[PDB]
From a paper:
The unique features of the Val-Tyr complex are that the bottom space of the S2 subsite is occupied by four water molecules and the side chain of Lys206 is less ordered. In the Tyr-Tyr complex, one of the four water molecules at the bottom of the S2 subsite in the Val-Tyr complex is replaced by the hydroxy group of Tyr(P2) and the side chain of Lys206 is well ordered due to aliphatic contacts with the side chain of Tyr(P2). Because S46 peptidases involve conformational changes upon dipeptide binding, which reduce the degrees of freedom of the polypeptide chain, the transition from open to closed state is entropically unfavourable. For Val-Tyr, thermodynamic parameters were not determined due to low-avidity (Kd > 40 µM). The order of dissociation constants (Kd) of dipeptide (P2 a.a.; V > N > Y > L > F) was consistent with the result of competitive inhibition assay.
Residue numbers in the entry:
A (entry chain A), B (entry chain B): 23 to 719
């Protein structure tokens, strides 16, 4: 079914759920800290779920990819090889910034949020400050009790504010990853594609201090004991069977202005695609010259490949459903329907007009802003800017610090400086710097107007780029100890420093702060406009009987539907792949190089008792008409009885454009079958201690 | 069903043909000059069929592509535009070498052939000359009557020899080609792929002189009146319907030695695919610069793309079916089964070991032979070598002239020199010379033992190639009138020329002749070994009750089966594509850029009464489990009653490996539906004169 339904919409999807075949009572889903919703956790950008009362967490391989990469070396490459922790003490730290967020409480704070915003009257910066101070105040009151992290979510353009309270587990350990030839089978060739044969799963364990409270990594820490964990299905999942997903989709743009869509399709997607593929060929070449570069940049490369392929996908998607025309059509249809509605229709019209003029800005500057933004986000320079920015914010009292730089954020910044150790190589960073500066100096002179960068370049050719990279090569910020010194340092040490990256951070910061204030003014302007227009778009969608659910905003959503394939002319995609499809794609070479143990078990039909008679084999991946996006990776797929039948990990090629214009005919979630997960762990990359802890052994 | 059955195997397939659903009696098919089989013609490299009593002939677009290309200029591009001849006098000559072969007679000359071979005794070269002298005698005699052309066929490694007598139409004219965006919809992207949306058809007309006798192009010639022509099907083709193809498949390699297959998989296919893809990029680049090079090289580009992609598809198929494992098992099993026979087995085991010797010879110089072979077949150099060779053969009496340089061949040679006029651009030829010369000079010193070429290169780098290409640039063989002059010139005239291409031909010719004699010695050695071994393989294969049929060898074959899709893990390919499928792939960019008329017709559902209610639309292409290969292009697909339901044009991706190891599960023919052809001639690129002549108006 279409829709990323908030839990508070469970009453309107209660009937649809039962009709699709949910056998649980809908009000069992209503208890978000109950069985099974209470087992569903957020990782920040991925979903996971508890699957044992000893804090065992299951997610996708590509979600654990970060943590596996942090633990990998050129010699001991866990991304390539499995990882298995036979005992608690073998489990590896997923790194200082790894999180499990266990939902505690959702509180609607709409009335108070709207009063805070209104209390600022017509001043747009005042409105943004007012909402930010409201956010900070709600978060501070909510985080008063140790171990909780809270977050204010804005729904439906600001028509709804809800304050989420999570227990934040800060000690997450890697328990099991299949080899990358299973976790990532078919690599970037099969990414965003069906048929799919990817065992995209991994396991973490959540830990807490001896005292029960969240704690950073310590040998003393004990497994978290979740109230609720999912059970693997004992009922074989089959074609047409009900499935549902709970998870944390990050962002959809289905309510975007036709103008926002058009910018994205004509500029952002093609430009990012193009530059990412160029950077990717650079990182791949660097990785061939030094395995340590390949490992240290493997998370970036995976992530940029994903985006670049997705962006291409979305572009083909938009051509396939004429998204430009549908956006146009629906926008005009809302504006007309608003006209007929006499009195009450005028404010929404006005709101539209406001939101329109907002597209006008970035026309000549958008390449420049990408190239400078990308240069400023290379490792050494990014760390300099982050560290300098914190030193500035430290001056201010905590409640006036920029979000991301308050006391409650310090541990995350410090953990970022630490993780960079496993993700930084001077020679690779210098090539990224060179690449983005090369794009800047290739701009027309009129667009090459960044005063600071022009000063530091002292020219507009290759030699000028080389000499500035040469100069930035003198930074000491490649040293962890250096970064951790600067982490603590007064803004005056920064403004005095002769470190070329710090000097650059110091020179660019006035511009960055001005750019950020302009961003906040734009957010202020839209804080009454966006909500009134989207309320009208919604009220118009409702009038035509369409589905009304908010755009994804990284909060908890339910989607549901059934296991089913999709069709194109001449092709019917069947809802399941099987072991034989994996073996059939074997080329002996990346990314189609399964472990010999897999090729031998499939040749021997060693199904391990996991074959589905309807398929005549063990299912690997399955399709369903669920509505998931970025953030839903690792989401548990529950059958009619709330049992784990799989993990969400991907969409088919036609689904990627549903981020903008949803297509019920061809949008499918790809999931990894819980049977393939068990099969891998029995027959291929064994995890006997895990099968026992899951009560499958 | 599996097999490319010779007509003489109709007894064995009568039951199967009836089981599959043939309504025609099998003895109807045994009549090769009767109805429908007498409608089916050879084009030489393609199949076609008469579809009117006025000599109208239907074949693929890609078969007519050569003729369309010869009639095309940058200014008036019939490849891109289509072509329609609304009357006889508008029909364009398909060019001097276009032929239609109407089968007259097959006679089995097995015993005479073997006697002529046995009669030569023990010298391999003697046995080569003896079959060649025999071939020529059976041909020169069979070619006695004016209009006729005969060919000696070797079946099953020389276990059978059959003489084909054909009436040779020498005046072929383009009647109709749809636009390239229909004829080659999806271009190299959809080539060898299902689903497929390609209108792959064009119409020729066979002309003879007023006497009724075959003649070259003359304005005075009249349409040939065929004894037999296919009617378009009135019964709509559906899934599971019986279909059969009669056509001229070129070569299959199912009886190849395991070693021959291993050499093809490991060297020939990957190497040709690599160099062909580099040469295609060069041709695309020159074509983009110069519309004149684009049109002149479009036939070459189409062909090389087709082979390059085919070879990659075969390499992928070999791994999917483990072709190497199957060839090694079958060979090992035949060798063992031959030890189980006593005396009965000892000759075949003798023959095997002699065939292995041939493979080691070709190994040593395989790279040199490809690069020098390709260089010697560039346009000016190939013309020089062919022209000088013929002056040499002229010196000799005709009976003693090499196959292809006899009196009966002069017309084709002269044809080739004319057609090159529409297929040559000196600056493209120079890039081809450069490319293949660059591969030669890159070889290790030890492989660079072409004496003449090293003398002519005077170096082994880019600059030495640059200077050989500058020197060969002074040739005049770019002029048609120079070529036709050399076509008539004595051996001495050649030896006198200061034309550098001719001097090269003169210089290299002695080595080409030794290499050709050495090749005739191997062919002589092969003339008794090959039949003995292949008879053993056939014997072993019948013992297992496996289907036994000769490898394709450019002779007439029947294949049959049913309209059906195929499956892959996660995918069920449906047997038809439809109009909406063509519209859904539209991008407004080559190769997915349908005529505006097609999109308009599809968006309006103008099905011009051709809709199949079982599809909800007009069918475009369809799948069937027939056994076709290169040569079968333009083969009529006949329903149960022998009426035309479409034309064979391609195979699915997984089929192409069936050239070496037949895979019944995933081998399908892709045919264009006769309703799509009619639909295109009604609604898109009208041919109302052909709709009338075909009895569809």
């Amino acid at each position: 079914a279409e829709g990323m339904w908030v839990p508070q919409q469970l009453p309107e999807i209660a009937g649809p759920l039962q009709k699709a075949g949910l056998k649980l009572s809908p009000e069992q889903l209503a208890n978000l800290t109950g069985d099974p919703m209470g087992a569903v956790v957020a990782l920040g950008g991925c979903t996971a779920s508890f699957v044992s009362p000893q804090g065992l967490v299951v997610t996708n391989h590509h979600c654990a990819y970060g943590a596996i990469q942090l633990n990998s070396t050129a010699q001991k490459n866990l991304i390539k090889d499995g990882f298995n922790a036979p005992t608690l003490k073998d489990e590896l730290s997923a790194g200082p910034n790894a999180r499990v967020f266990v939902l505690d409480q959702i509180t609607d704070v709409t009335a108070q949020a709207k009063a805070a915003i209104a209390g600022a009257g017509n001043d747009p910066l005042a409105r943004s400050r007012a909402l930010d101070a409201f956010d900070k105040a709600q978060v501070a009151a909510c985080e008063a009790d140790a171990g909780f992290r809270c977050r204010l979510y804005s729904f439906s353009g600001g028509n709804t504010y809800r304050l989420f309270r999570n227990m934040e587990i800060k000690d997450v350990r890697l328990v099991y990853a299949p080899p990358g030839s299973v976790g990532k089978f078919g690599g970037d060739v099969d990414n965003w594609m069906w048929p799919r044969h990817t065992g995209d799963f991994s396991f973490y364990r959540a830990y807490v201090g001896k005292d029960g409270k969240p704690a950073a990594f310590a040998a003393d820490n004990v497994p978290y004991q979740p109230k609720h964990f999912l059970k693997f299905a004992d009922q074989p999942l089959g074609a047409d069977d009900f499935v549902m997903v709970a998870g944390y989709p990050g962002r959809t743009n289905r309510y975007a202005l036709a103008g926002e869509f058009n910018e994205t399709a004509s500029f952002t997607y093609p430009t990012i695609a193009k530059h990412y593929n160029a950077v990717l060929k650079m990182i791949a070449d660097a990785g061939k010259a030094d395995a340590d570069v390949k490992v240290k940049y493997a998370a970036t490369a995976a992530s940029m490949n994903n985006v670049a392929k997705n962006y291409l996908g979305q572009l083909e998607g938009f051509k396939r459903i004429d998204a430009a025309g549908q956006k146009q059509a629906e926008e005009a249809a809302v504006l007309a329907w608003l006209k007929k509605q006499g009195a009450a229709g005028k404010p929404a019209l006005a709101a539209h007009a406001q939101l329109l003029k907002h597209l006008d800005t970035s026309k000549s500057t958008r390449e420049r802003d990408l190239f400078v933004g990308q240069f400023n986000n290379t490792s050494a320079v990014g760390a300099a800017i982050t560290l300098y920015r914190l030193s500035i914010e430290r001056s201010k009292p905590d409640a006036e610090r920029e979000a991301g730089y308050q006391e409650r954020d310090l541990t995350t910044i410090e953990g970022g400086l630490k993780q960079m150790d496993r993700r930084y190589v001077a020679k690779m960073d210098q090539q990224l710097q060179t690449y983005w500066l090369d794009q800047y100096v290739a701009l027309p002179a009129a667009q090459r107007d960044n005063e600071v960068l022009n000063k530091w370049l002292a020219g507009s050719d290759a030699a000028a780029v080389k000499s500035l990279v040469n100069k930035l090569g003198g930074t000491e910020l490649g040293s962890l100890d250096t970064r951790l010194k600067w982490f603590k340092a007064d803004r005056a040490a920064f403004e005095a420093s002769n470190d070329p990256a710090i000097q650059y951070a110091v020179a660019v910061m006035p511009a960055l702060l001005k750019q950020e204030e302009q961003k906040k003014i734009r957010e202020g302007e839209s804080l009454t406009a966006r909500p009134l227009y989207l309320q009208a778009v919604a009220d118009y969608k409702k009038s035509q009987g369409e589905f009304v659910y908010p755009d994804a905003n990284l909060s908890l959503r339910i989607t549901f539907g059934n296991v089913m394939g999709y069709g194109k002319d001449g092709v019917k995609y069947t809802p399941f792949t099987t072991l034989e499809g994996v073996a059939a794609k074997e080329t002996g070479e990346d990314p189609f190089d399964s472990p010999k143990a897999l090729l031998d078990a499939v040749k021997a039909k060693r199904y391990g008792g996991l074959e589905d008679k309807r398929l005549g084999s063990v299912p690997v991946n399955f399709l369903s008409n669920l509505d998931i996006t970025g953030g839903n990776s690792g989401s548990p797929v529950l059958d009619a009885n709330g049992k784990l039948v799989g993990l969400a990990f991907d969409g088919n090629w036609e689904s990627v454009s549903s981020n903008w214009v949803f297509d019920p005919v061809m949008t499918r979630m790809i999931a990894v079958d819980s049977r393939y997960m068990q099969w891998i762990m029995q027959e291929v990359a064994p995890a006997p201690q895990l099968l026992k802890e899951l009560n499958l052994a």
